[PDB]
Symmetry: C3
Subunit: 112 residues, 3 copies
């Protein structure tokens, strides 16, 4: 019955060999799942840089249309005269702020 | 050859011991991806809020430049006269739409 | 001492049977994980399409405000006169560019 305990130890090993395989099946879809995370963060970071491009072009161009509008309304007391207090509203320069967040996403996910 | 079957039983146990280790590594990886997923969704959601900020300032500011241009062109039949039917085109207010989507990404991933 | 090696082989099998159990306890929590990557890429791709909509409306509307400003400044030598060389700066049409990137993120992650 030594040869018996050895046939049982062999059955165990056969069955816990089955599990190892099944397990590997579930925990299987997970390697590049990190590489897929590094790619989502890359394309995203790319579309965000095209918006910063466009967005800063609109800001400059529209601030230039106010420079012209300020000239034309001079002969009227100025823009603040024709527009009211809204003449004070101007678009901020979110370039650096937006830039720094786009750099974080990269450093944190794409360079890693 | 009893001592043989016992040397093989020992090699299996050696190899299925290696798997357990490797598996624990993945079962340890996906935690990273689970977490890292909630962080990409956070930063992204942050850069999207700065664009909503910038974008609505441009919309308001440019609607105000048309209010001035509307005044100046009065002595000409009005903007619709100088510009044609495009005088009807105005930028929509996507603030709520954009806002709802940024709220989804947060609720779904950051919270 | 054969019955000894058999007692040790039996202890290992007992301990590597404990791991298999504990591992099974963790494993479960990770495979909708691939459906989580597909979802971040989805919403993201949705918020980027609303910005492309907004962004192109600002560009068109602002180019139309320059058309009006070009007319009013005619009785002065033209905008290029009142504004200088910046009169040449105009906002580009990043529609296609931004569109193609949003289609990449989709194909690669949402539709994939
Ligand atoms: Cl404008
Ligand atoms: Zn001995």
């Amino acid at each position: 019955q030594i040869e018996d305990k050895i046939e049982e130890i062999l059955s165990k090993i056969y069955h816990i060999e089955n599990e190892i395989a099944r397990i590997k099946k579930l925990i299987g879809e997970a390697d590049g799942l990190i590489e897929g995370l590094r790619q989502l963060a890359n394309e995203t970071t790319q579309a965000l840089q095209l918006f910063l491009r466009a967005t800063t072009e609109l800001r400059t161009f529209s601030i230039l249309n106010r420079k012209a509008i300020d000239f034309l309304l001079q002969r009227w007391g100025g823009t603040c005269h024709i527009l009211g207090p809204d003449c004070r509203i101007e678009p901020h320069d979110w370039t650096k702020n937006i830039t720094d967040k786009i750099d974080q996403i990269i450093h944190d996910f794409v360079d890693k």
